[PDB]
């Protein structure tokens, strides 16, 4: 079958801290002698816009209580960085991993370590949509939950949870403080943008179906990448790029991308009553990387 899986979370679990400001408490990311967390921890709002420049000016350092487990970290200073705060603390995180900052692109998958009260509670895999939103599972207290990817021994931090749109999907910022999709860290009316199926991920999915004996839906026809792309942009699907990354999957199925593109066009928003690996529509969830990794264990 095809599972959304998470990468092991241990390396990140020891970077999570509880950040309390007054009454408000959420999660922070604790690397070196700095704690990153969503800036709205110092604001108290329900229905109106927040003046963050003012909230920062009134901010009092002694109203912070930051803890890793039952170990409290003295707050030294705090500065604002986009939708985040840089909080300088008393000591270094000895368990600071080898890490980098990386901003996710649409279509790319990463891991979410769902945290509550400064403790990791659950871990699951997600995929960044063309929306620059994700379909996470978050409730009250989840803010500051980190998103990450582990790449050759290196932890790539890419997400800190900020926000749930009315549609139920979720938005975070990267570790530079930049809100994905230019959404705003306010409780204002913000409609989830239009999104397209990331076609490359759909291609990976259909390859996975061929590999698992699902071949009823295959078309005999073909379209060139260049002509599919001009159809895709007007039919709520993204354009297809280099296609080199589909060589391993093509070799394993003897099926080229062009023929899969043809299957997609006949399928898109017009499935029968049939399913494909238990899916009733084309899924955006899995990358070629994930599919190749899960079926053959190579990267």
């Amino acid at each position: 079958g095809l599972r959304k899986m998470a990468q092991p979370s241990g390396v990140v679990e020891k970077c999570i801290v509880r950040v309390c400001y007054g009454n408000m408490a959420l999660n922070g990311l604790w690397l070196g002698d700095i704690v990153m967390c969503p800036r709205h921890v110092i604001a108290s709002s329900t229905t109106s816009t927040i003046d963050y420049d003012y909230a920062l000016s009134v901010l009092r350092l002694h109203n912070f209580s930051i803890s890793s487990g039952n170990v409290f970290l003295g707050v030294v200073s705090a500065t604002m960085r986009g939708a985040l705060l840089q909080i300088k603390v008393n000591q270094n995180n000895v368990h600071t991993p080898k890490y980098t900052y990386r901003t996710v692109r649409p279509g790319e998958s990463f891991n979410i370590l769902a945290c509550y009260d400064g403790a990791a509670a659950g871990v699951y895999g997600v995929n960044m949509r063309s929306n620059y939103t994700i379909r996470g599972s978050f409730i009250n207290g989840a803010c500051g939950s980190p998103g990450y990817n582990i790449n050759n021994g290196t932890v790539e931090f890419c997400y800190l949870h900020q926000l749930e749109l009315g549609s139920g999907c979720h938005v975070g910022s990267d570790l530079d403080g930049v809100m994905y999709g230019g959404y705003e860290d306010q409780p204002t009316l913000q409609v989830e943008g239009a999104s397209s199926l990331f076609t490359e991920n759909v291609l990976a999915f259909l390859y996975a179906a061929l590999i698992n004996g699902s071949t009823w839906w295959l078309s005999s026809s073909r379209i060139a990448v260049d002509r599919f792309n001009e159809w895709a942009v007007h039919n709520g699907m993204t354009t297809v790029g280099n296609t080199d990354c589909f060589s391993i999957l093509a070799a394993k199925t003897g099926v080229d991308v062009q023929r899969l593109l043809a299957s997609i066009q006949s399928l898109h928003k017009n499935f029968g009553g049939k399913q494909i690996l238990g899916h009733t529509s084309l899924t955006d969830e899995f990358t070629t990387g994930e599919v190749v990794r899960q079926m053959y264990g190579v990267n």
Binding site: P38, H40, S45, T47, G136, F138, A142, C143, S145, H161, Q162, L163, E164, L165, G166, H170, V171, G172, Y183, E184, D185, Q186, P187, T188, L189, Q190
Partner: peptide, 5 residues
């Protein structure tokens, strides 16, 4: 509306 978590 958007909901700050």
């Amino acid at each position: 509306x958007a909901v700050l978590x």
